[model samples]
Target chain A: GSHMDEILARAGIFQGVEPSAIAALTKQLQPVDFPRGHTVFAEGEPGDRLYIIISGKVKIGRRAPDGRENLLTIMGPSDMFGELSIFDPGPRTSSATTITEVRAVSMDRDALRSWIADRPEISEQLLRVLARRLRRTNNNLADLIFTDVPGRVAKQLLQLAQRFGTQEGGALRVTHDLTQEEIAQLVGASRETVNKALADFAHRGWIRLEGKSVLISD
Target chain B: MDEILARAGIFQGVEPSAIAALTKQLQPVDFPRGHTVFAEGEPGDRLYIIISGKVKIGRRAPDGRENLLTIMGPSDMFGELSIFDPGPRTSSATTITEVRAVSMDRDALRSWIADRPEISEQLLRVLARRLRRTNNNLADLIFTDVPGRVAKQLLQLAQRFGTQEGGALRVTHDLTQEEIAQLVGASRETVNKALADFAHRGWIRLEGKSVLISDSERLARRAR
Candidate 1:
């Protein structure tokens, strides 16, 4: 009878939950929107909500002491963020920003806590969410160990595309806006290095860089 | 009889009778030093709980070079990730010393958690702790210098392995030079030189296989 139920059902942290529980939880969600480049939350702020994307995209990131920001990932529809602080309550570990005009639904920590207390299955589901993230981060760490700068940038581009790319005409387009400096932050390289890698890719026609976005050949 | 399980932080709040039942499901196993308990890319659906001794969790690079993750001793856990998730172990685990542990197969582990839902909460805490550690390591790679990284790792080990000896803390991980280097994710020559530098600065004293942190305040400052 509710429109938001399917969205909550598709979210990773709500898997295996009953439909009635999902419906009740959906009622607790507050639909939110942001224009492009808006900061949804920032590091060191008291975080209490988990956001699930309903439309558009958000970039999750962290800042360096030198004022450089690392674009951790561009997450789109059905994806969730701001969850880590829910289990281990404190200041937010990372910042979230709207890459494009975005729409999402959010729920506070207390609501989730009540649900978890009533149904421990929700806790297990949340555990699996952390498990999946740990697996991905572990693999990324290994890649850092074995892969060089260019190699890592290449891997990261494909990964972002796999999660957020779309087909327009004959080319696959990734419209997640990121600067060369930001890409360098993601790959743990210098801005010049990422700049060189992208230029090299564009020169070879392997990928086309347009307005800081990337397009892959068919 | 069921002391180790009872002592595990993950098993806390679990009914003692339930813990005894879980203990019954575990198989007692003993391993000699240098034994490969399990390896990377192998089927892994069992969990191991160390009762005593040390184990090193390591991974192999594509070039067949080895890099270690961390060391585990008494009351520490290994094989947990594989048991709750799918097969094909994430890394290889080898005995650094004669090891005694209790183990359980995947099915038994699943049934145990299904019966005691609170165990899932404990497990989540465990996973959360590990993920935070890993994220910090990744952050260190980006932010900390190699020597600084070594200092941070030394502080971590001291937290786990340090024993008070008057004004100093003696960390008895007993890891070899190469193993320590691998854990630090740096080359042996460089890490050894860093340790030597610390020793030269009177911040540490290197013994046979242990390090005496005579000036941990200075070391912690370096770690930052």
Candidate 2:
């Protein structure tokens, strides 16, 4: 078995599939990679393929007409991006950027459509992924509606910890690889305000700041 | 064919046999105004489609401040997020008026989907549209000011409840200022200020709770 099979088996969309089934699917994944700070795709570009992240982090976002980007989400290893365009017909609604030097594999949209038809569970799993995405988007909408800058920062930290944290003694240490500016974009605050919020959280002992990473307790 | 199911956007293009199967799986449910169909964080087992009346999907913060996320009218679906993942409900649904809806248990819906897999695409499309709407809402919050949001929200409500009166579009929702404030995601005073400014500009007049939009082209011009 290759790393591709491991990633396919580990991804949220492909979980519960047999190793053999995953092996068959991985054989079709063509090698793809990028350096840090690369734009994998941009909004309005034809969405021609789906990508699977094997390592590193990425930011998914849409650029405002005024020229600033609105960060929608940050993704990590084994996470699938570009899956939505395969399910519907449209150009890309958002752009994806690599936060760190990245490694990944991708499959063509036409091939994916045929493959999912051959494996019904794959499509069901894809639906499950989309359903979870809708839930997260809704939560983000609600948070943006009601949460103040500091409140939103805290909420985003805890949520990211669920996916990226590793237990370290009494705390969950999250190496989310997000810069202060990126954090501001994600929480919809200015960088200065986000920095103050982080300082406040550190002073409150709600979180311990370690460089770009964070240590959260309870 | 079920009248409502046949016209339900999700059921369009589905073969008649499958529609008959879905009709059998879907059961009717009814509620009166101010009824709580379900609450946030409760385990969800059924997905509902509104056949008549309106439903409010809303959320409450830990501080007990509540906001209306969106309004669902006829042919809209709710309680579907949980059916896909089998978790607690993300938001609550309350009836804005007496409602007649169709309900399908998650298990029943899943089996029916298995037999008629084409329905899965329809379901995915529904979820995609929802995600797109939520994304739009976020963009509006981030990019637009309170007044612009108020104007945009009014125009949206007008799509559902507006009636023509001469050259004016009269929105008949009669939604209170407080509800409008919630929908606009602004403080009552802030939203009221925006409303009054619109009236001052001769763009709109608050008719009791309903609104008479004298010039939607002007309102829409400012909405962006």
Candidate 3:
């Protein structure tokens, strides 16, 4: 009977929830749009809502003391943000910015709380999402502690390729808006080092960097 | 028994009757000090809630190097992430002291949560806090150096297990230099140097295996 139900149903956090509960959630979801380069939310601000991306890319990152931007990850369709703040009220841990014109739906904290109370299955799904994030962050920490700069960069490239790339002939082409400096931030390396690594990859025929984009060959 | 569940914070807000029922589902287990409760890459099918004693969560490298993630005291939990997402354990848990814990199998725990919706709320809160802590740890590892990390690690441990005694906070845990090095992700030699520098600065006092933070604020500033 509702148009927004399917969208909510498809979300990772709504998996296993009853159809009626999903329908009720649709009523609380407010469809929103953000233009390219728009800052969706900033760090230290109050986290009052959860946003679900329906289209386009969003860069989640935080700033270092010297004003360096440490890019965390690029989230795409079906990915959710501010979900952690729903259960634990606090200042936003990181900032999210749209990389392209984006379409999204947001649910405020009150609605999220009520919906979870009504459908406990959604809480389990939320746990699954948070658990996956914990594992990913834990893996990142381990890599940061144990892996060298070049190894981290190479591993991060492969991870990004898996998330954002599309098959083009024998290679996977990632048509991203990320710069070498941003990649350096993601991999915890210097921009110069990331540049040299990219050059090395090019020399080895594993990958080719064209301006801001990259194509990785298997 | 009900008191233990109530003290665990996760059982907070849950009805006493429900807690009693949940406790019935939990099976108590004991591990002596230095015992490995679970190893990394093993199947994670149970959640453990500490009743007493301490546990260390860590990972070991192929070369035998170990990095301690964090320590869990009474009322703290481990292996919870597996309840929602069944996978290999991310870190190994070793008993730092003789540990008494109550564990619940995955299916039983899920059913309990289904029966008591309030428990789900508490679990979500716990997971959210853990996610935030992990993010902070990740940020620290990426941005801080050896001494800074050691300082931060001490502050964190003190915050969780410290006792206020005018002018100083006393951390009673008898953590060895090697264990401290593992916790801070530094070599034992580097950790020794950092601790010596702190002791020399009169910021901390080493008493046997325990550490007394005579000036926590100064140490916190050093962490920055």
- What candidate 2 gets wrong by more than 4 Å, as runs, is A17-19, A46-49, A64-66, A107-112, A122-129, A132-146, A157-166, A172-190, A202-218, B1-4, B7-9, B16-30, B41-44, B135-145, B155-174, B202-224
Using DockQ as the measure, name the better of candidate 1 and candidate 2: 2
Which candidate has the highest lDDT of all? 3
Cα lDDT of model 1 by residue, A1-218, tens digit? 25556755788776656767777777877788899778899988997778898888787777754476665666788888876556556687778888678889888767876777777666656665667667667767766756654676656656766676688777778875567554454443235545666677778787876776768765
Calculate the i-RMS of every candidate, to one decimal place.
Answer: 2.6, 2.5, 2.2
- Deviating ranges (above 4 Å) for candidate 1: A1-10, A14-24, A34-49, A90-92, A97-102, A108-110, A116-133, A167-171, A176-193, B1-4, B7-9, B13-27, B215-224
Cα TM-score of candidate 2: 0.79
Off by over 4 Å in 3: A1-11, A14-27, A136-140, A177-204, B1-4, B16-27
Please, what are the lDDT tens digits per residue for candidate 3 over residues B52-138?
A: 889988888777878887889888888877777889898899998898999888788777676677777777778788888887776
Ranking by TM-score, best first? 3, 1, 2
Better of 1 and 2 by TM-score: 1
Score every model by TM-score.
Answer: 0.81, 0.79, 0.84
What tens-digit string does per-residue lDDT give for candidate 1 at B1-224?
A: 46766766568655747567557667789999989999888997777889888999888898876777789988788887776566578789999889998887767766766667667766776776777677677666654677998998888999998999999999988788888988888778889999999999999988877899999999988875
DockQ of all predictions against the true structure, Cα-based: 0.36, 0.40, 0.47
Question: Could you tell me the lDDT of residue A138 within candidate 1?
Answer: 76
Among residues 3 or more apart in sequence or in different chains, the pairs in candidate 1 whose N, CA or C atoms overlap within 3 Å are: none
lDDT score, candidate 2: 0.77
Tell me the tens digit of each residue's lDDT in model 2 across A1-218. 46656765686556655566666777777767799879999989997677889888888777654466766667888887876665664788778888888888877657766666777776566677778888888887787689764576566556667677788887788866667665555544234444665687778887877787778875
lDDT, candidate 3, at B140: 66
